[PDB]
């Protein structure tokens with residue numbers, strides 16, 4: 011099966027025990043909101059919701075998230091199948107921790123570095139194959155495209171103009187620099203550089219990072235001549251404040267039941283949505299009562315993926 | 319003299335002894351087709367043709383081809399004279415073997431690697447000159463331009479748009495990457511990379527390589543301030559199936575007796591045709607009877623160069 | 627104070643003692659032309675002029691010029707303030723010697739190499755700051771833009787098209803290559819490369835270098851997140867032969883009392899003129915009588931800066 015939707019709950023000392031309930035199947039989650047105090051509201055409002063997804067992860071290690079959501083998609087990529095892993099959820103819920111993780115201790119590193127590590131590990135198990143790895147790192151902010159690995163990465167589209175294009179092989183970004191990474195250390199160094207660059211560019215350009223989408227792309231070529239891309243995506247916060255998410259959610263509604271070019275995000279991800287791609291959605295949610303309404307919104311989104 | 323036309327015959331256990339005859343002068347070749355069996359045809363059809371070119375090479379070593387067709391043109395380049403060496407002929411006749419040669423034993427390497435070797439050797443004989451070498455590698459396929467040394471060389475013009483341009487110094491390719499090669503090993507590595515890339519791109523883009531033109535360019539700068547280019551060209555098979563050859567043949571007809579921009583090939587080679595260039599044509603022909611008609615077509619083309 | 631104007635007199639065995647007089651204040655210079663021999667002219671013509679600038683340097687060492695005109699502006703740059711140092715004056719007066727200096731002995735090196743040296747020295751005094759240095763090198767000639775560090779730097783705008791652009795951060799040059807310099811040796815090597823390239827490009831493109839403007843840009847990023855540029859400018863000779871200077875002089879007249887886009891120079895330097903920049907003008911003048919008229923023209927220009 012090509013599309014998966016998971017939920018990762020953020021750990022908390024103050025878990026909403028009464029309001030958040032995990033199914034025995036480890037795939038279900040039920041939300042029980044507190045009844046409204048207003049007499050007109052309390053007897054007209056739905057307070058209970060049930061959701062069945064591909065997996066629900068709470069108090070899950072980084073190692074376990076990777077094994078569960080990511081490992082297979084990265085495996086299929088060396089065989090020529092495009093894979094996208096996307097983190098979605100409100101600001102603070104755990105998207106960047108899930109995708110990047112701790113930048114200063116191995117055990118707590120996230121999906122993206124483990125993906126790079128797995129690619130190069132896998133290349134060792136295929137000694138008769140000439141496997142070549144390339145990377146790019148793109149930020150989308152307010153309908154503008156930024157190259158996190160460009161030669162002057164703290165200045166905008168005026169200097170480094172980029173345009174999403176399409177060909178028989180998929181969707182690429184004209185102007186977005188593509189870097190050959192011979193070994194995992196080359197790929198790790200570039201991930202570090204682009205992350206440093208992202209931070210500098212947010213300060214330099216007065217961007218709110220909660221509103222940006224970041225897409226790290228691994229381009230694979232192995233020769234049987236095969237090519238693929240793995241897209242590792244940290245989305246803008248879903249609390250819609252960030253318009254482009256609405257086109258992404260609209261797209262996913264359409265696929266379940268599309269103007270891809272209407273939005274940079276949906277255009278960049280066209281090949282990840284319509285058909286020829288292993289899509290994994292990781293839905294980051296708070297475990298606390300005060301965020302339950304945004305949590306339900308995220309879970310309703312997560313729940314659209316089974317119909318795609 | 320600025321224009322030379324040679325013929326190289328491909329070696330064969332089944333040579334067409336009755337039908338292919340080499341002149342004593344080592345410059346002539348005569349073709350004697352078999353008479354048609356049809357009564358209306360046999361007494362109205364020309365079966366004998368004679369051709370005089372600058373040299374006819376049969377059962378010739380790689381070392382001898384280089385010394386004969388290429389060596390002088392590469393010499394003149396360090397002195398500031400542009401040089402083009404072009405292989406022409408039907409698919410299977412020996413264009414790629416003549417231009418690239420054996421990629422896995424020194425003795426049988428072709429023109430292109432020997433040219434790179436000669437350039438850097440010559441730089442050693444000129445110790446008071448600061449000589450700088452740069453390279454590019456371009457494939458032309460079906461009126462599209464591809465950079466064999468680009469950062470993502472298995473995707474097309476959509477990502478890496480290129481445009482042939484002209485200035486007081488000649489014709490160049492905007493968007494085509496140009497690589498400084500400090501030593502012969504840097505140039506050899508890039509030739510290897512672009513060749514690997516060509517193969518991957520043919521599989522990835524479903525190109526038939528018999529239909530593509532490939533142009534390796536050596537840009538020389540030596541300081542008396544001098545610049546030159548050496549263009550080493552492996553043309554599309556001449557069996558016209560490949561349209562662009564017809565504009566090249568038309569061009570050469572015109573020069574002997576021009577809309578350069580009508581065709582990418584003729585535009586890219588504008589400076590190699592009209593005037594200020596040492597042009598060497600190497601015409602690759604089969605030695606076998608079954609290919610004699612295409613052989614004659616190639617020799618008629620080869621024979622247009624003496625009038626240029 | 628943001629704008630400074632200095633004068634550097636070129637040393638001479640034949641100094642114009644009667645006609646050139648230095649004020650005690652080391653900031654003033656007076657010019658006394660020789661009376662015209664024509665009866666109608668001599669009693670209607672001004673022969674005496676006085677000028678007060680920020681400093682007048684005669685028989686000044688390279689070390690002293692740097693300390694006086696440049697040192698502070700380079701200091702302010704690490705703190706986030708943009709700085710431009712510009713050499714102006716007639717061909718032969720000392721612009722290139724002041725800005726580049728002797729390329730073959732340390733003591734006599736000019737402003738530009740000392741600036742690069744000071745930047746990297748200063749980075750050592752700031753061990754808790756991550757400071758990143760980038761460079762570009764641009765020649766402006768006859769309204770065309772050239773990249774002195776491009777991949778084929780002896781061919782023009784046809785291959786390497788560049789466009790001056792503007793954003794909330796200032797004015798940059800789309801298409802102009804930007805090079806990360808990790809250490810002073812990387813920056814020194816690129817300065818050497820671009821200078822070699824400039825010379826080759828002047829011969830190759832038949833440029834008169836007295837008519838070109840050259841702008842070496844140091845891009846600084848330090849993290850408090852700060853960015854700046856230092857622009858080190860060697861202008862075209864002011865003997866106007868070179869049109870673009872007239873728009874620069876017009877601009878400076880306007881600021882003292884603007885169509886920046888009318889001229890590549892003024893557009894490239896927009897951020898150096900209107901407001902947010904530490905501008906230092908170094909006015910190179912001959913010490914000899916035969917050049918006194920061009921000297922006065924330069925000093926009248928130098929004198930416009932105090933009103934900016």
Ligand SMILES: Nc1ncnc2c1ncn2[C@@H]1O[C@H](COP(=O)(O)OP(=O)(O)O)[C@@H](O)[C@H]1O
Pocket residue numbers: 019020021099100101102103104105106107108294
């Ligand atoms: N599973 C988790 N375990 C421990 N800490 C987490 C986890 N998920 C998120 N956090 C922490 O919560 C904070 C917010 O997480 P982050 O990934 O930055 O949210 P988002 O990217 O969705 O805005 C971070 O300081 C991070 O350390």
Ligand SMILES: Nc1ncnc2c1ncn2[C@@H]1O[C@H](COP(=O)(O)OP(=O)(O)O)[C@@H](O)[C@H]1O
Pocket residue numbers: 327328329407408409410411412413414415416602
């Ligand atoms: N002079 C030669 N000596 C030995 N083998 C040759 C020679 N010319 C061509 N060949 C062989 O013939 C085949 C076709 O040659 P190739 O150069 O690929 O043709 P083209 O490029 O014109 O299609 C190759 O396998 C090559 O090894």
Ligand SMILES: Nc1ncnc2c1ncn2[C@@H]1O[C@H](COP(=O)(O)OP(=O)(O)O)[C@@H](O)[C@H]1O
Pocket residue numbers: 635636637715716717718719720721722723724910
């Ligand atoms: N202060 C100085 N001390 C010694 N020589 C100088 C000085 N200024 C200029 N020169 C010399 O004068 C010549 C012209 O100077 P240059 O800097 O090339 O002029 P410009 O760049 O203004 O045309 C050079 O040969 C240079 O060595």
Ligand SMILES: [Cl-]
Pocket residue numbers: 070071072073117118
């Ligand atoms: Cl963990």
Ligand SMILES: [Cl-]
Pocket residue numbers: 378379380381425426
């Ligand atoms: Cl041989």
Ligand SMILES: [Cl-]
Pocket residue numbers: 686687688689733734
């Ligand atoms: Cl000095």
Ligand SMILES: [Mg+2]
Pocket residue numbers: 105106107244
């Ligand atoms: Mg985040």
Ligand SMILES: [Mg+2]
Pocket residue numbers: 413414415552
């Ligand atoms: Mg071939």
Ligand SMILES: [Mg+2]
Pocket residue numbers: 721722723860
């Ligand atoms: Mg000069």
